[PDB]
Amino acid sequence: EMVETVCGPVPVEQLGKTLIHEHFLFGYPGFQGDVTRGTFREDESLRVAVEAAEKMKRHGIQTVVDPTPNDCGRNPAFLRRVAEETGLNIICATGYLYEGEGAPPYFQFRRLLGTAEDDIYDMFMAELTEGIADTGIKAGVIKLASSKGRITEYEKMFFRAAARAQKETGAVIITHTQEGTMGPEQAAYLLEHGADPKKIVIGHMCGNTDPDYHRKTLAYGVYIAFDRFGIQGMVGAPTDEERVRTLLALLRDGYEKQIMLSHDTVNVWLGRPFTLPEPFAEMMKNWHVEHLFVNIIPALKNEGIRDEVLEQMFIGNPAALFSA
Amino acid sequence: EMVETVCGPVPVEQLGKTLIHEHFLFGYPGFQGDVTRGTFREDESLRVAVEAAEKMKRHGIQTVVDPTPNDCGRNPAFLRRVAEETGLNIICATGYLYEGEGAPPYFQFRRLLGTAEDDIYDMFMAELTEGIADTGIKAGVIKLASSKGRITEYEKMFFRAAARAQKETGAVIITHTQEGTMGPEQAAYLLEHGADPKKIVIGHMCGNTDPDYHRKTLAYGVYIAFDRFGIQGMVGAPTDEERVRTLLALLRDGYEKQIMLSHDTVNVWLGRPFTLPEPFAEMMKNWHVEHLFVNIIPALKNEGIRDEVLEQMFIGNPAALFSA
Ligand SMILES: [Co+2]
Ligand SMILES: [Co+2]
Ligand SMILES: [Co+2]
Ligand SMILES: [Co+2]
């Protein structure tokens, strides 16, 4: 009946309207080494993060799941500061990013020692049931990630440890898929290791534009996330128009009880500030926390998507996800 | 005349006996994510670090170059506390590890922006001439690293930036070579971009057992470092017996003014504590800061190496390296 937030245990029935995948703070592994020229502005970062939290509250959002990985500058105490100020429910994660964009050398070394999987399991259990560092904050979700075209041996260690921790705690698993690949394989690998499909969210599914690929993943009984609305412009990556077109094809087939939507925003970047190039910046202009409510939902309503369907995705599914 | 230490500028003539490559603190990238089970205890880490520094002092060591990379838990403030407690001169570095064992995602993203090399150069200049993070502590060396059998495009950015910074500051470059590869390639590439050979130390050269490989590197007029004494057991790393055999061959060939010696010890490991298996631990038993003086030096002196030659490597070469 309860889920661990950055402000302690909160009743699952009181979560309400939820964004399943947003980042208040995020940095690419290695940002720590650029501290001299990319200093952390704590007061300014809080101001921007609270501003983003207030923007979501104006659209009826009461809960945000922040799946910032452990190796990507996850800061539970900072998230608590945002939540204590706004009253917004924030659920943080425990886990690492995939091999290509994470920081693997540490657990790759423990893999050589032959304790890595047990060490990761131990980390998951400690952060889910005891607390993260000395913050007293317990993670409410386990974050997993896989590479493009394959789930690597490094990544599989985390997948097996998450499945073990999932059986012991009943925690929710949120995943990262790279470039619309490994969706069905993630679900398959987790289930055969004992994980509950009703507690798994396969993320970044909007990265694939083939409805058959989605149906194959949805066949496992898992949740899928169209969580990257706003991110477009890359040569291989899909557009928001292609995302909606894929979403409408699944809502026609009646998969609403298994679909959730988000933006995957990075509200405050860790490390040195940057500016996107002229063509890319224009294509990424819609990448903000209000995009779904201002642009996407009205476009869905014009296609004939009912309010009950939208409320099932934003309110119903998160409530069913965190419930035992 | 002067060199930047963690306590400020120190006369190069006062550096005395120096260990060119030792780590007081070190963590594999990703250690930050294991904060709950691998918390950094500053006070007990300082005790172990001071204990290591005092063991160096037993053998007349007055200066240590600590080339811990930015992405490997480099902590100049901690090193300052070690230096103040012991009276030891500690020179720290600016730089990142190689692609395979470092944290590349951050500066790989900045390459997509097209500013990475300039950003890295800017970082080098800041930390060599202005101060690291929230301190006035300046780095005294630039740390570079390459992969096995290749200097990757990612790595080449740091090499080009280092050569640029070297030309403008006169700073020392110290390198990491992976598994006895790329020694000549590193020297050649640095000199292509205008770096001063008398200011370059090609590291981990003991990882190769072919004297011709060393002579190819030495022909560039650079320093080479037999800096991993004590590290044995792994494929395909050499034994201390093989290191000594290679070292003796070069010393008898008259290369003493280009050679420096170290252990590459990690005195305090960042992250979760670990234990090596007994067959591996027995092979690594001599990996400590006293090894060169208690085991290697008496073995060298029995093989005809005079105290003057030893003092040339430990005192003369570091003095010449840091001098204009
Ligand atoms: Co992701
Ligand atoms: Co994300
Ligand atoms: Co090294
Ligand atoms: Co080293």
UniProtKB/TrEMBL annotation, chains A, B:
Zn(2+) 1 binds at H21, H23, K143, D264. Fe(3+) 1 binds at H21, H23, K143, D264. SUPFAM superfamilies: Metallo-dependent hydrolases. Its EC number is 3.5.-.-. Binds 2 divalent metal cations per subunit. The modification N6-carboxylysine is found at K143. The keyword Zinc applies. Fe(3+) 2 binds at K143, H176, H204. It holds the Pfam family PTE. The keyword rRNA processing does not apply. It is an enzyme of class 3 (hydrolase). Keywords: Hydrolase, Metal-binding, Zinc. Belongs to the metallo-dependent hydrolases superfamily. Phosphotriesterase family. This is Phosphotriesterase. It comes from Geobacillus kaustophilus (strain HTA426).
